[PDB]
Coordinates of C-alpha atoms and ligand atoms in Angstrom, one line a residue:
Chain B
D1 CA 7.9 13.0 -22.8
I2 CA 4.8 10.8 -22.1
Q3 CA 1.5 12.6 -22.6
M4 CA -1.7 11.3 -21.3
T5 CA -4.8 11.5 -23.4
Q6 CA -8.1 11.8 -21.6
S7 CA -11.5 11.2 -23.0
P8 CA -14.3 12.4 -23.0
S9 CA -13.3 15.9 -22.0
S10 CA -16.9 16.4 -20.7
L11 CA -19.3 13.9 -19.3
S12 CA -22.8 14.2 -17.9
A13 CA -25.2 11.8 -16.3
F14 CA -28.1 11.6 -13.8
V15 CA -27.7 10.6 -10.2
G16 CA -27.5 6.8 -9.8
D17 CA -26.3 6.3 -13.4
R18 CA -22.9 4.6 -14.0
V19 CA -20.0 6.8 -14.9
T20 CA -16.7 5.9 -16.5
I21 CA -13.9 7.7 -18.2
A22 CA -10.8 6.5 -20.1
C23 CA -7.2 7.7 -20.3
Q24 CA -4.3 6.5 -22.5
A25 CA -0.6 6.8 -22.3
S26 CA 1.7 7.5 -25.3
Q27 CA 4.2 5.0 -23.8
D28 CA 3.8 1.9 -21.7
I29 CA 3.8 3.2 -18.1
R30 CA 2.9 0.0 -16.4
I31 CA 0.5 1.1 -13.6
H32 CA 2.1 4.3 -12.6
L33 CA -1.0 6.4 -12.4
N34 CA -2.6 8.9 -10.0
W35 CA -6.2 9.9 -10.6
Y36 CA -7.3 13.2 -9.1
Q37 CA -10.7 14.9 -8.4
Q38 CA -10.9 18.7 -8.5
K39 CA -13.9 20.3 -6.9
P40 CA -14.4 23.9 -7.9
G41 CA -12.3 26.2 -5.7
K42 CA -10.1 23.4 -4.4
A43 CA -6.6 21.9 -5.0
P44 CA -7.2 18.5 -6.7
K45 CA -7.6 15.6 -4.3
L46 CA -5.8 12.4 -5.0
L47 CA -8.4 9.6 -5.2
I48 CA -6.6 6.6 -6.7
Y49 CA -2.9 5.7 -6.7
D50 CA -0.7 3.2 -8.5
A51 CA -3.6 3.0 -11.1
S52 CA -6.0 0.9 -8.9
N53 CA -5.4 1.4 -5.2
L54 CA -8.2 3.4 -3.7
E55 CA -7.0 6.2 -1.4
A56 CA -8.0 6.5 2.2
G57 CA -11.2 8.4 2.8
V58 CA -12.4 7.9 -0.7
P59 CA -15.8 6.0 -0.9
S60 CA -16.2 2.6 -2.6
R61 CA -17.9 4.2 -5.6
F62 CA -14.5 5.0 -6.9
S63 CA -12.4 2.4 -8.7
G64 CA -9.6 2.2 -11.2
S65 CA -8.0 -0.4 -13.4
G66 CA -5.8 -1.0 -16.5
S67 CA -2.1 -1.3 -17.4
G68 CA 0.4 -0.4 -20.1
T69 CA -1.2 2.2 -22.2
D70 CA -5.0 2.0 -21.5
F71 CA -6.5 2.9 -18.1
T72 CA -9.9 3.5 -16.8
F73 CA -11.7 5.1 -13.9
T74 CA -15.2 4.7 -12.6
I75 CA -17.2 6.4 -10.0
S76 CA -19.8 3.8 -10.1
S77 CA -23.3 5.1 -9.4
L78 CA -23.0 8.9 -9.6
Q79 CA -23.8 11.1 -6.6
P80 CA -24.1 15.0 -6.5
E81 CA -20.9 15.2 -4.4
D82 CA -18.9 13.8 -7.3
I83 CA -19.2 17.0 -9.5
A84 CA -15.5 17.6 -10.3
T85 CA -13.0 17.8 -13.0
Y86 CA -11.1 14.5 -13.0
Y87 CA -7.5 14.4 -14.1
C88 CA -4.9 11.8 -15.2
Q89 CA -1.4 11.9 -14.0
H90 CA 1.4 9.5 -14.3
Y91 CA 4.8 9.2 -12.8
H92 CA 6.6 6.7 -15.0
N93 CA 9.5 9.0 -15.7
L94 CA 10.3 12.7 -15.6
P95 CA 8.6 15.0 -16.3
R96 CA 5.5 13.9 -14.5
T97 CA 2.7 14.8 -16.8
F98 CA -1.1 15.4 -16.5
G99 CA -4.0 14.7 -18.7
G100 CA -6.5 17.4 -19.9
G101 CA -9.2 16.9 -17.4
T102 CA -12.7 15.5 -17.7
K103 CA -15.5 17.6 -16.5
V104 CA -18.2 15.6 -14.8
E105 CA -21.6 17.2 -14.4
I106 CA -24.7 15.8 -12.7
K107 CA -28.4 16.1 -13.9
Chain J
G1 CA 24.8 11.7 15.9
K2 CA 23.9 9.8 19.0
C3 CA 22.2 7.0 16.9
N4 CA 23.6 3.8 15.6
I5 CA 22.7 2.2 12.3
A6 CA 19.9 0.0 13.7
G7 CA 18.3 3.1 15.2
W8 CA 18.6 5.1 12.0
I9 CA 17.3 2.5 9.6
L10 CA 14.4 1.3 11.9
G11 CA 13.4 4.8 12.8
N12 CA 14.1 5.0 16.5
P13 CA 12.1 8.1 17.6
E14 CA 15.3 9.8 18.8
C15 CA 16.9 9.6 15.3
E16 CA 14.0 11.5 13.7
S17 CA 16.0 14.7 13.9
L18 CA 18.7 13.2 11.6
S19 CA 18.8 14.4 8.0
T20 CA 18.6 12.0 5.1
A21 CA 21.7 11.8 3.0
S22 CA 21.3 11.0 -0.7
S23 CA 24.8 9.4 -0.8
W24 CA 27.7 8.9 1.5
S25 CA 31.3 7.8 1.5
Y26 CA 31.4 6.2 5.0
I27 CA 29.4 6.0 8.2
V28 CA 30.3 7.8 11.3
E29 CA 29.0 6.9 14.7
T30 CA 30.2 8.2 18.0
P31 CA 31.5 5.8 20.8
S32 CA 28.3 7.0 22.6
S33 CA 25.9 6.0 19.7
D34 CA 23.5 4.3 22.1
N35 CA 20.1 4.9 20.3
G36 CA 19.5 1.6 18.4
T37 CA 16.7 -0.9 18.8
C38 CA 14.3 0.4 21.6
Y39 CA 12.0 -2.6 21.6
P40 CA 14.3 -5.4 22.7
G41 CA 15.0 -8.3 20.3
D42 CA 17.4 -9.9 17.9
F43 CA 18.4 -7.7 14.9
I44 CA 19.3 -10.4 12.4
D45 CA 22.2 -10.2 10.1
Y46 CA 22.9 -6.8 11.5
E47 CA 26.6 -6.8 10.6
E48 CA 25.9 -7.6 7.0
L49 CA 23.3 -4.8 6.8
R50 CA 25.9 -2.4 8.3
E51 CA 28.4 -3.4 5.6
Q52 CA 25.9 -3.0 2.8
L53 CA 25.0 0.5 3.9
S54 CA 28.6 1.6 4.6
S55 CA 29.1 3.3 1.2
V56 CA 26.1 4.3 -0.8
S57 CA 26.0 5.8 -4.3
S58 CA 22.4 6.7 -4.1
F59 CA 19.8 6.4 -1.3
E60 CA 16.2 7.5 -1.0
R61 CA 13.3 6.7 1.3
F62 CA 9.8 6.2 0.1
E63 CA 6.6 5.2 1.8
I64 CA 5.9 1.6 0.7
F65 CA 2.7 0.6 2.3
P66 CA 0.8 3.8 3.1
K67 CA -0.3 4.0 6.7
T68 CA -3.8 5.0 6.1
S69 CA -4.8 3.0 3.1
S70 CA -3.0 -0.3 3.1
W71 CA -4.6 -1.9 6.1
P72 CA -8.3 -1.0 6.3
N73 CA -9.0 -4.1 8.3
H74 CA -6.3 -3.8 10.9
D75 CA -5.6 -1.3 13.7
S76 CA -2.6 0.8 12.9
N77 CA -3.0 3.3 15.7
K78 CA -2.8 1.2 18.9
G79 CA 0.6 -0.2 18.0
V80 CA 2.6 1.8 20.5
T81 CA 4.8 1.2 23.5
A82 CA 6.5 2.6 26.6
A83 CA 9.7 1.0 25.4
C84 CA 10.0 3.6 22.6
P85 CA 8.7 6.8 24.2
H86 CA 8.6 10.1 22.4
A87 CA 8.4 13.3 24.5
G88 CA 6.8 11.1 27.2
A89 CA 4.2 9.6 24.8
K90 CA 4.0 5.9 24.0
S91 CA 5.3 5.5 20.4
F92 CA 7.0 3.2 18.0
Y93 CA 9.5 3.0 15.2
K94 CA 9.0 5.5 12.5
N95 CA 9.6 3.2 9.6
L96 CA 7.3 0.4 10.9
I97 CA 3.7 -0.2 11.8
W98 CA 2.6 -2.6 14.5
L99 CA -0.8 -3.9 13.5
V100 CA -3.2 -5.2 16.0
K101 CA -6.7 -6.6 16.0
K102 CA -9.4 -4.4 14.8
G103 CA -12.4 -4.7 17.1
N104 CA -12.3 -8.3 18.0
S105 CA -10.6 -9.9 15.0
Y106 CA -7.4 -10.1 13.0
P107 CA -8.4 -11.0 9.4
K108 CA -5.8 -12.8 7.4
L109 CA -3.4 -10.3 6.0
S110 CA -2.0 -10.4 2.5
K111 CA 0.1 -7.6 0.8
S112 CA 2.6 -7.1 -1.9
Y113 CA 4.9 -4.6 -3.6
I114 CA 6.5 -4.7 -7.0
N115 CA 9.8 -3.0 -7.5
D116 CA 9.4 -1.9 -11.0
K117 CA 11.3 1.4 -10.7
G118 CA 15.0 0.1 -11.1
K119 CA 16.9 0.4 -7.7
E120 CA 17.4 -2.3 -5.1
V121 CA 14.9 -2.0 -2.4
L122 CA 15.6 -2.6 1.3
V123 CA 12.7 -3.8 3.2
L124 CA 12.7 -4.3 7.0
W125 CA 10.0 -5.9 9.2
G126 CA 9.7 -7.5 12.5
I127 CA 7.9 -10.1 14.5
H128 CA 6.4 -9.9 17.9
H129 CA 6.9 -12.6 20.6
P130 CA 4.4 -11.9 23.5
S131 CA 5.2 -12.9 27.0
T132 CA 1.9 -14.4 27.6
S133 CA -1.2 -15.8 25.9
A134 CA -3.1 -12.9 27.5
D135 CA -1.1 -10.6 25.2
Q136 CA -1.8 -12.7 22.2
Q137 CA -5.5 -12.4 22.9
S138 CA -5.2 -8.6 23.4
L139 CA -3.1 -7.8 20.4
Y140 CA -3.8 -10.4 17.7
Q141 CA -6.9 -12.3 18.9
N142 CA -6.0 -15.4 17.0
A143 CA -4.4 -17.8 19.4
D144 CA -2.5 -19.9 16.8
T145 CA -0.8 -17.6 14.3
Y146 CA 2.0 -17.5 11.8
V147 CA 3.9 -15.0 9.6
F148 CA 5.2 -15.6 6.1
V149 CA 7.5 -13.4 4.0
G150 CA 9.0 -13.9 0.5
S151 CA 10.5 -12.8 -2.8
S152 CA 12.2 -14.6 -5.6
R153 CA 15.3 -15.1 -3.4
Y154 CA 13.6 -15.4 0.0
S155 CA 11.1 -17.5 1.8
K156 CA 10.5 -17.9 5.4
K157 CA 7.7 -19.0 7.7
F158 CA 8.0 -17.7 11.2
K159 CA 6.2 -18.8 14.3
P160 CA 5.8 -16.7 17.6
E161 CA 7.4 -17.8 20.8
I162 CA 5.3 -17.0 23.8
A163 CA 7.3 -17.1 27.0
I164 CA 8.1 -15.0 30.0
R165 CA 11.5 -13.5 29.5
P166 CA 13.6 -11.3 31.8
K167 CA 12.4 -7.7 31.5
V168 CA 14.4 -5.5 29.2
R169 CA 13.2 -1.9 29.0
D170 CA 10.2 -3.2 31.1
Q171 CA 9.2 -5.6 28.4
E172 CA 8.6 -9.3 29.2
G173 CA 8.4 -10.1 25.5
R174 CA 10.7 -9.5 22.4
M175 CA 10.5 -8.2 18.9
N176 CA 12.9 -9.5 16.2
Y177 CA 14.1 -7.6 13.2
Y178 CA 14.5 -9.0 9.7
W179 CA 15.5 -7.6 6.4
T180 CA 16.0 -8.4 2.7
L181 CA 16.9 -6.7 -0.6
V182 CA 14.3 -6.9 -3.3
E183 CA 16.0 -6.9 -6.7
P184 CA 14.6 -4.5 -9.4
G185 CA 11.9 -6.3 -11.3
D186 CA 11.0 -8.5 -8.3
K187 CA 8.1 -8.7 -5.9
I188 CA 8.0 -8.9 -2.1
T189 CA 5.0 -10.3 -0.3
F190 CA 3.8 -10.5 3.2
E191 CA 1.2 -12.8 4.8
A192 CA 0.1 -13.2 8.4
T193 CA -2.6 -14.2 10.8
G194 CA -0.9 -12.2 13.6
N195 CA 2.3 -11.0 15.2
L196 CA 3.6 -9.2 12.2
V197 CA 5.0 -5.7 12.2
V198 CA 4.8 -4.4 8.7
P199 CA 7.1 -1.9 6.9
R200 CA 5.7 1.5 6.4
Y201 CA 8.7 2.9 4.7
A202 CA 11.4 1.3 2.5
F203 CA 14.6 2.4 0.9
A204 CA 15.7 2.4 -2.7
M205 CA 19.4 2.3 -3.3
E206 CA 22.7 1.6 -5.1
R207 CA 25.8 0.4 -3.2
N208 CA 29.2 2.0 -3.8
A209 CA 31.3 -1.2 -3.5
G210 CA 32.0 -0.6 0.2
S211 CA 34.0 1.4 2.8
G212 CA 33.9 1.3 6.4
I213 CA 32.6 2.6 9.6
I214 CA 34.4 5.0 11.9
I215 CA 33.6 5.2 15.6
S216 CA 34.7 8.6 16.7
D217 CA 34.0 11.9 18.4
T218 CA 36.2 13.7 15.9
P219 CA 33.9 16.3 14.3
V220 CA 32.9 16.4 10.6
Chain U
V1 CA -0.8 18.0 7.4
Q2 CA -0.8 21.6 6.0
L3 CA 1.1 23.4 3.3
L4 CA 0.5 27.1 3.0
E5 CA 1.5 29.1 -0.1
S6 CA 2.6 32.7 0.4
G7 CA 3.5 35.4 -2.0
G8 CA 1.6 36.1 -5.2
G9 CA -0.1 39.0 -6.7
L10 CA -0.1 41.1 -9.9
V11 CA 3.1 42.1 -11.5
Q12 CA 4.2 43.6 -14.9
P13 CA 6.2 41.4 -17.4
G14 CA 9.9 41.2 -16.7
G15 CA 11.2 41.4 -13.2
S16 CA 10.4 38.6 -10.7
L17 CA 8.0 37.4 -8.1
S18 CA 9.0 35.3 -5.0
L19 CA 6.8 32.5 -3.7
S20 CA 7.3 30.4 -0.7
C21 CA 5.4 27.5 1.1
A22 CA 5.4 26.9 4.8
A23 CA 5.1 23.3 6.0
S24 CA 3.4 22.0 9.1
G25 CA 2.5 18.6 10.6
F26 CA 5.4 16.6 9.2
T27 CA 9.1 16.3 9.1
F28 CA 9.7 18.6 6.2
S29 CA 13.3 17.7 5.9
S30 CA 12.4 14.1 5.1
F31 CA 10.6 14.8 1.9
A32 CA 11.1 16.1 -1.6
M33 CA 8.9 19.0 -2.6
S34 CA 7.5 20.4 -5.8
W35 CA 5.5 23.2 -7.5
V36 CA 2.5 22.6 -9.8
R37 CA 1.0 25.2 -12.2
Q38 CA -2.7 25.5 -12.9
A39 CA -3.3 27.6 -15.9
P40 CA -6.8 28.8 -17.0
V41 CA -6.3 27.1 -20.4
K42 CA -4.1 24.1 -19.7
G43 CA -5.6 22.4 -16.7
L44 CA -2.5 21.1 -14.9
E45 CA 1.1 21.8 -15.8
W46 CA 4.2 21.3 -13.7
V47 CA 7.0 23.7 -12.8
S48 CA 9.8 22.4 -10.6
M49 CA 11.0 20.0 -7.9
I50 CA 13.7 19.7 -5.3
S51 CA 15.0 16.6 -3.4
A52 CA 14.6 16.4 0.3
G53 CA 18.2 17.4 1.1
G54 CA 18.2 20.1 -1.6
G55 CA 21.0 18.3 -3.4
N56 CA 19.2 18.0 -6.7
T57 CA 16.6 19.8 -8.7
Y58 CA 14.5 19.2 -11.8
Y59 CA 12.8 21.9 -13.9
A60 CA 10.2 22.0 -16.7
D61 CA 11.9 22.9 -19.9
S62 CA 9.5 25.8 -20.0
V63 CA 11.0 27.4 -16.9
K64 CA 14.4 25.9 -17.0
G65 CA 17.1 28.5 -17.2
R66 CA 14.9 31.1 -15.5
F67 CA 13.4 29.7 -12.4
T68 CA 15.3 28.8 -9.3
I69 CA 14.0 26.4 -6.7
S70 CA 15.5 26.2 -3.2
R71 CA 14.6 25.2 0.3
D72 CA 15.7 25.6 3.9
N73 CA 14.8 22.7 6.1
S74 CA 15.5 24.5 9.3
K75 CA 12.6 26.8 8.7
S76 CA 10.3 24.1 7.1
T77 CA 10.2 26.3 4.0
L78 CA 10.1 25.8 0.3
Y79 CA 11.0 28.7 -2.1
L80 CA 10.5 29.5 -5.8
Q81 CA 12.2 32.4 -7.5
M82 CA 10.0 33.2 -10.5
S83 CA 12.5 35.3 -12.5
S84 CA 12.2 36.7 -15.9
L85 CA 8.4 36.6 -15.8
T86 CA 6.0 36.6 -18.8
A87 CA 2.3 36.7 -19.5
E88 CA 2.3 33.0 -20.1
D89 CA 3.3 32.4 -16.5
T90 CA -0.1 33.5 -15.2
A91 CA -1.4 30.6 -13.2
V92 CA -2.4 29.4 -9.7
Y93 CA 0.6 27.9 -8.1
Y94 CA 0.6 25.0 -5.7
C95 CA 3.3 23.4 -3.5
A96 CA 3.2 19.7 -2.7
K97 CA 4.6 16.8 -0.7
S98 CA 5.9 13.8 -2.8
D99 CA 6.1 11.2 0.1
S100 CA 9.6 10.3 -0.9
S101 CA 13.0 11.9 -0.7
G102 CA 14.6 11.2 -4.2
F103 CA 12.2 12.1 -7.1
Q104 CA 12.2 8.6 -8.6
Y105 CA 10.0 6.7 -6.1
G106 CA 6.9 8.6 -4.8
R107 CA 3.3 10.0 -4.8
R108 CA 2.2 13.7 -4.8
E109 CA -0.3 13.1 -2.0
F110 CA -0.7 16.5 -0.5
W111 CA -1.0 19.8 -2.1
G112 CA -1.6 23.2 -0.5
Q113 CA -4.5 25.3 -1.7
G114 CA -2.4 27.6 -3.8
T115 CA -1.8 31.2 -4.7
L116 CA -2.4 33.3 -7.7
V117 CA 0.3 34.8 -9.8
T118 CA -0.7 37.2 -12.6
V119 CA 1.6 38.8 -15.0
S120 CA 0.3 41.9 -17.0
Chain Y
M1 CA 54.4 1.7 -3.1
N2 CA 51.1 2.0 -4.9
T3 CA 48.0 1.2 -2.8
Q4 CA 44.3 1.0 -3.7
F5 CA 41.2 2.0 -1.9
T6 CA 40.6 -0.2 1.0
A7 CA 38.6 -0.4 4.2
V8 CA 40.4 -2.1 7.0
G9 CA 37.9 -2.4 9.8
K10 CA 35.6 -5.4 10.0
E11 CA 32.8 -6.1 12.4
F12 CA 32.0 -9.4 14.1
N13 CA 29.5 -10.5 16.7
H14 CA 30.1 -12.4 20.0
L15 CA 29.7 -15.8 18.4
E16 CA 32.2 -15.0 15.7
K17 CA 35.3 -14.7 18.0
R18 CA 37.3 -17.1 15.8
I19 CA 36.7 -14.9 12.7
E20 CA 37.6 -11.7 14.5
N21 CA 40.7 -13.4 15.7
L22 CA 41.5 -14.4 12.1
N23 CA 41.1 -10.9 11.0
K24 CA 43.5 -9.8 13.8
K25 CA 45.9 -12.4 12.7
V26 CA 45.8 -11.0 9.2
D27 CA 46.4 -7.4 10.4
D28 CA 49.2 -8.5 12.7
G29 CA 51.1 -10.4 10.1
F30 CA 50.9 -7.5 7.7
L31 CA 51.9 -5.1 10.4
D32 CA 55.0 -7.0 11.4
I33 CA 56.1 -7.5 7.9
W34 CA 55.8 -3.8 7.0
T35 CA 57.3 -2.5 10.2
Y36 CA 60.3 -4.8 9.9
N37 CA 60.9 -4.4 6.3
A38 CA 60.6 -0.6 6.6
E39 CA 63.2 -0.5 9.4
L40 CA 65.6 -2.6 7.3
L41 CA 65.0 -0.5 4.3
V42 CA 65.8 2.7 6.1
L43 CA 68.8 1.3 7.8
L44 CA 70.2 -0.3 4.7
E45 CA 69.5 2.7 2.5
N46 CA 71.0 5.1 5.0
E47 CA 74.2 3.3 4.9
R48 CA 74.2 3.0 1.1
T49 CA 73.3 6.8 0.8
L50 CA 76.2 7.7 2.9
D51 CA 78.6 5.5 0.9
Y52 CA 77.2 7.0 -2.3
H53 CA 78.1 10.4 -1.1
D54 CA 81.5 9.3 0.0
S55 CA 82.0 7.7 -3.4
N56 CA 81.2 10.9 -5.3
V57 CA 83.7 13.0 -3.4
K58 CA 86.3 10.3 -3.6
Chain K
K1 CA 13.4 -21.8 37.4
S2 CA 15.7 -18.9 37.5
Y3 CA 19.1 -17.7 38.6
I4 CA 20.4 -14.2 39.1
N5 CA 24.1 -13.5 38.6
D6 CA 24.6 -10.8 41.2
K7 CA 28.1 -11.7 42.2
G8 CA 30.1 -10.0 39.4
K9 CA 31.7 -12.7 37.1
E10 CA 30.4 -13.9 33.8
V11 CA 28.5 -17.2 34.2
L12 CA 28.6 -20.1 31.8
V13 CA 25.6 -22.1 31.8
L14 CA 25.2 -25.3 29.8
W15 CA 22.1 -27.4 29.3
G16 CA 20.8 -30.0 27.0
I17 CA 17.7 -31.3 25.2
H18 CA 16.5 -34.9 24.8
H19 CA 15.2 -36.2 21.5
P20 CA 13.6 -39.7 22.1
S21 CA 13.6 -42.3 19.5
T22 CA 10.0 -43.2 20.1
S23 CA 6.7 -41.9 21.5
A24 CA 7.1 -44.8 23.9
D25 CA 10.1 -43.1 25.5
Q26 CA 8.3 -39.8 25.6
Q27 CA 5.6 -41.5 27.7
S28 CA 8.2 -43.2 30.0
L29 CA 10.4 -40.2 30.6
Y30 CA 8.3 -37.1 30.4
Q31 CA 4.6 -38.3 30.3
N32 CA 3.5 -35.3 28.4
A33 CA 3.1 -36.2 24.7
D34 CA 3.4 -32.6 23.4
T35 CA 6.2 -30.7 25.0
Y36 CA 8.5 -27.8 24.7
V37 CA 11.6 -26.2 26.2
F38 CA 12.3 -22.5 26.6
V39 CA 15.5 -20.8 27.8
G40 CA 16.4 -17.1 28.0
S41 CA 18.4 -14.1 29.4
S42 CA 18.6 -10.5 28.4
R43 CA 20.7 -11.5 25.3
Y44 CA 19.2 -14.9 24.6
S45 CA 15.9 -16.5 23.8
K46 CA 15.0 -19.7 22.3
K47 CA 12.1 -22.1 22.2
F48 CA 13.1 -25.7 21.4
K49 CA 10.9 -28.6 20.3
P50 CA 11.8 -32.3 20.5
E51 CA 12.3 -34.4 17.4
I52 CA 11.1 -37.9 17.9
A53 CA 12.6 -40.3 15.3
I54 CA 14.4 -43.6 15.1
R55 CA 18.0 -42.8 14.4
Ligands
LIG301 C1 17.9 7.0 23.7 O1 19.2 6.8 24.4 C2 19.1 7.2 25.9 C3 20.5 7.1 26.4 O2 21.0 5.7 26.5 C4 18.0 6.3 26.6 O3 17.9 6.8 28.0 C5 18.1 5.8 29.1 O4 17.0 4.9 29.3 C6 17.2 3.9 30.4 C7 16.0 3.0 30.5 O5 14.8 3.8 30.8 C8 17.5 4.6 31.8 O6 17.8 3.7 32.8 C9 18.8 5.6 31.5 O7 19.1 6.3 32.8 C10 18.5 6.6 30.4 N1 19.8 7.4 30.2 C11 19.8 8.7 30.3 C12 21.1 9.4 30.1 O8 18.9 9.4 30.8 C13 16.7 6.5 25.8 O9 15.7 5.6 26.4 C14 16.8 6.0 24.3 N2 15.5 6.2 23.6 C15 15.1 5.4 22.7 C16 13.7 5.6 22.1 O10 15.7 4.4 22.3

């Protein structure tokens, strides 16, 4: 199995500050990533697919990049609407596996 | 059922009710399998495609260029026609998107896909040939356009033919269909300044040597 | 589109609970479907998946041998038989659309909002 | 008479008439050969069979 | 120009396209320097372009 490692597990910043998180694979998974945003009380929303393709309806603040075993995610200049737990997911092989989740708080 | 292979693989609206088989030993069409291409044109190398699909060890469909996120600069909703109606509505092939000018422009299009998952991928696309320059201005805006498609084993530049043709299914123009197999590990690209119908869905597969096609009303 | 989970609730260990998911807005029979587990401790886990035609399934090792996944395309419905339940299976369960038919190629684009299964 | 897995039918378009006709030529030659040889085999063996039986009782 | 085959038999139509050796012939025979030819039917469509070259 391929297990994603996500870091930091908790992040905070003030509105307008630049926010980034990182996630690593235990195996080379090319670019087979799906980044998710889980707002409290909701099923997680897919925001970025195939590591860097921004999903429809997701604002330009969001961006992803990386390959192989080291991937990143940015939400650019942080807005209040972005409070969520962000998750790693990859689909290189079976089973599909998730990361631990990074809680992003704003203040 | 009542569909032929072109109908089934392109996504004729009337073939939507068919299930997807993961594998099959042979293909059965009835003598009345009339639902094929609904927007008239030349389906290129149709016989070779029919042979390749005759016996399949594994087959799956996947969305290749997502309808809502792949073309933010092009209109993917106005690409419908009375030639392929669905329940009385104008519609189009289920596995294809006919992109038209957004607002008053058609920005140069450039897209690619990498087949890094291991099966051969079948990609189909088409090209629109308007009957008049008045359609070229309504659908693509750019008066002088081209389409280019390629892979490590394929390269072709296409040019539209604007001409008034006899009406077929009330259309004075035509739309041709093209296809290729992208080997695992390869990349397929598309480029256009207009007149390109882009794949929405593509198939991943493995061929089981080959069988045959039976045309019959004998039940399964 | 919509995916609506049904079934759930509080049960004692042992026995079973049956979940289902109703699909709407898409040709259900054209897509592979799966269940995802959201535990209070482990953020997101996975349970099982079935191919679009129902021909093949894949299970987490943690539920393999117990759970059964099945579907009936004529009813646009996905089912999960949560047999031999334990305390460790308490989680919010979600159904989702993979946007492919064969497991290997795909994207889990759309999830329902889930249901809660509690074992105690 | 041990055969393998085959698929007989072939499909050609309207500008491939010469190929379809070649395919027919192939099917026809094989058909005439098998039909004729089969008739001779049956007629020959039936006579030999009946002689064999006549031999054993003789 | 057009023709409608409403009498019942299949109709065989032949035509040809001229490819001049020089632009001087194009001006003598067709006048238009930049030309094209198009032919079609419900099962046929082709746009042709002349090739001017000395052969
Ligand atoms: C699916 O096949 C049917 C049957 O061939 C098509 O219906 C015919 O459409 C033509 C053109 O409008 C009519 O002249 C015929 O009378 C219709 N036939 C019948 C039995 O009603 C139908 O258009 C095809 N649909 C698609 C999307 O290809």
